[PDB]
Amino acid sequence: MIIDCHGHYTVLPKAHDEWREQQKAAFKAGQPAPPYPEISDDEIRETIEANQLRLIKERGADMTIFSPRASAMAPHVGDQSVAVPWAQACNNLIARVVDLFPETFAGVCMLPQSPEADMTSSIAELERCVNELGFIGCNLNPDPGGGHFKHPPLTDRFWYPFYEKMVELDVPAMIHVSGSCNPAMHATGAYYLAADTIAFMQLLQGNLFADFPTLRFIIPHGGGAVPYHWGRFRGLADMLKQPSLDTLLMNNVFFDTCVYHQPGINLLADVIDNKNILFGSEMVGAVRGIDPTTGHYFDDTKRYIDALDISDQERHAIFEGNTRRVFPRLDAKLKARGL
């Protein structure tokens, strides 16, 4: 089995983006937001079937772990009064897609984070999503201010009440920022990668997993700059007098394979331990075109693992095993289906 660990609901029913701009325009006008529209299951079936389900079929995947659209999380302007109904509405959409397609999609939640609030409503939405909607994970935005890193590092006690709910519920988080309000910083091509790189160093500077020994993070997009500069990060453990990386982090930190070329993927498999590598592609996302240089899709990352010269034990772990051990609720669901 091939479980795609990274994916967002990007091609949406039209009334959803419509309401989102009315909710945005009503808040900056001092008005309440209009009622959320009704969306048909056939409309939801249409968006999914035309896009995600088609490519999963073509590309030989079985499941995709599905979360709200990453750019549209935009936890900026304005406040919690926008963030909570928006986060709730997007995850309700994710829950409905799983209802219509439960053998293929597993849910991961966005959180109603915003710069002016602590993690109280996100702990609520995580609980609502895991307990009532059957979700298996969350998306954690390390900079809900969106491009100036004006929020505390992930080792800060600001985050500690949130991590306790994660560990009790046994759910991991993918560190994942959203849209950028910084003109100097494009989101999907720079801001995503910088936050990944910064997040990994933040953990390297501290000892979070001394406090939460079972807490597990995924840093997406092959870990930002990190495997490419792996030797730089090992040497900094020594420069900081910190424990070696294999013990400090790599039992709690895992990287996905949304690196969009064979040489980036060849390097990931070469430098990061097989158990820390999770298959992902983030299809219908940042890079939707074909590679002139290969004739295959950029985000068809299975082709890079499939082209690797690895053992079947290694193929099983990237494609299915690693994700099921980091997401226990998904392992438990697949056992209960005999898989």
Binding residues are 6, 8, 69-71, 176, 192, 221, 288
Residue 128 or 151 having the CB closest to a copy of itself: 151
**217 part of the interface to a copy of itself, by CB under 8 A:** no
Q: In the range 126-165, which residues lie near a copy of itself by CB under 8 A?
A: 142-143, 147-153
CA geometry: angle 51, 326, 57, nearest 5 deg: 20
Counting contacts by CB under 5 A, is residue 94 touching Zn ion? no
Interface positions, 278-317, toward Zn ion (CB under 5 A): 282
Query: Smaller CB distance to a copy of itself: residue 134 or 206?
Result: 206
Q: Is the Cα dihedral 121, 122, 126, 129 positive or negative?
A: positive
What is d(CA 313, CA 321) in angstroms, rounded to the nearest whole number? 9
Token digits for 103? 């053998």
Does residue 70 touch Zn ion according to CB under 5 A? yes
Q: What angle do CA 50, 16, 60 make, to 5 degrees?
A: 25
> Exposed/middle/buried for 218, CB within 10 Å: 0-12, 13-18, 19+?
buried
- For position 295 contacting a copy of itself by CB under 8 A, the verdict is no
Bridge partners, residue 175, by sequence? 140
The answer to whether residue 103 is catalytic is no
Dig out the tokens for 292 from the structure.
Answer: 């002139």
Stretch in the footprint of a copy of itself (CB under 8 A) among 50-58, 113-121, 133-141, 282-290? 282-290
Q: Tell me if 296 contacts a copy of itself by CB under 8 A.
A: no
Residue 7 CB burial class (10 angstroms; 0-12, 13-18, ≥19): buried
Provide the binding-site residues for Zn ion, judged by CB under 5 A. Answer: 70, 282
- Catalog residues that contact a copy of itself under the rule CB under 8 A: 142-143, 147-153, 182-186, 188-191, 193-194, 197-198, 200-202, 204-205, 221-222, 224-225, 227-236, 238-239, 259-261, 263-264, 266-267, 270-271, 286-289, 291, 293, 298-299
